């Protein structure tokens, strides 16, 4: 189980190289300039840029609920919001329910409801998300994942977090640090399909991975074979 020491996000014309640090037990204590603290039954992740912080409540080996402070783009403007989330498990299936309120006057801003459905092998097969806006207007997405190419990796982090469907940087860390204590932290989807608002729009992408002796050293998501949508470069070297 090899350790990721450097992650490099390629967002536009400029790079973003983040150094990852670990304690004597292998626990992540830094993701770039974002610290990760462990106090009793809690995990607190510091500032990100987007996310101001998130505190996860750990119960019986899994995150049960979380609270985050973040910036939320609602209409045209962005609000300093408070996010309240609960994590529920029924078999392998994961229910994520989040409520966004303004820090200032507690005004309700957004509701996000996500369903993560896994197959027999523990692979994430489908993600269903429902977004309720302040005006009660509803949008949804159904995401489907294909594993026919049988791409498998071995790493300390749950690298699926760099390609799967989640709401917010707190959900990114929730999956990346395996706070849901997922049965399969080995498979990578080769293709992803999106069906928005029951067919009003659809989108299909391909995930491309270059592996350096079983470790993914590059994660790419492409549209129509050539339009690069995201590129994450990873290092496993101690430095």
**How many whole angstroms separate alpha carbon 189 and alpha carbon 3?**
21
DSSP 5-61: -EEEEEETTEEEEEEEEE-TTS-EEEETTEEEEEETTEEEE-----EEEEEEEEETT
**Domains: count for the chain:** 1
Instruction: Please tell me what resolution, in angstroms, this structure has.
Output: 2.8
Q: Which domain holds residue 106?
A: 1-239
CATH number of the domain residue 212 falls in: 2.40.160.150
Strand, coil or helix: 172: helix
Backbone breaks in the chain after residues (C–N over 2.5 Å): 49
| Cα-only R_g, the chain | 18
Q: Name, in order, each residue with C-beta under 8 angstroms of 183's C-beta and a sequence gap of 6 or more.
A: 92, 118, 122
CB burial of 94-105 (b: ≥16 within 10 Å; e: otherwise) equals bebbbbbbbeee
Q: Measured in Å, how far apart are the chain's first and last C-alpha atoms?
A: 18
């Amino acid at each position: 189980d090899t350790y990721v020491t450097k992650v490099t996000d390629l967002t536009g014309e400029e790079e973003q190289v983040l150094k990852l640090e670990y304690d004597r037990d292998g626990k992540i204590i830094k993701y770039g300039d974002t610290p990760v603290r462990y106090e009793g039954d809690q995990i607190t992740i510091g500032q990100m840029n987007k996310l101001c912080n998130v505190t996860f409540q750990i119960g019986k080996g899994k995150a049960r609920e979380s609270r985050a402070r973040c910036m939320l783009k609602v209409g045209e403007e962005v609000y300093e919001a408070d996010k309240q989330t609960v994590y529920d498990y029924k078999g392998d299936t994961i229910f994520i329910n989040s409520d966004y309120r303004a820090t200032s006057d507690y005004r309700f801003l957004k509701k996000v409801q996500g369903k993560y459905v896994f197959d027999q092998l523990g692979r994430l097969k489908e993600v269903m998300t429902v977004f309720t806006e302040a005006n009660d207007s509803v949008s949804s997405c159904h995401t489907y994942y294909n594993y026919d190419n049988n791409i498998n990796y071995q790493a300390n982090l749950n690298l699926q977090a760099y390609v799967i469907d989640y709401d917010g940087v707190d959900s990114f860390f929730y999956f990346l640090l395996n706070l849901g204590q997922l049965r399969n932290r080995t498979a990578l989807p080769n293709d992803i399909g999106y069906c928005m608002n029951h067919g009003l729009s659809t989108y299909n992408v391909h995930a491309n991975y270059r592996l350096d002796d079983e470790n993914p050293v590059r994660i790419e998501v492409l549209y129509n074979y050539t339009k690069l949508l995201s590129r994450i470069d990873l290092s496993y070297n101690p430095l």
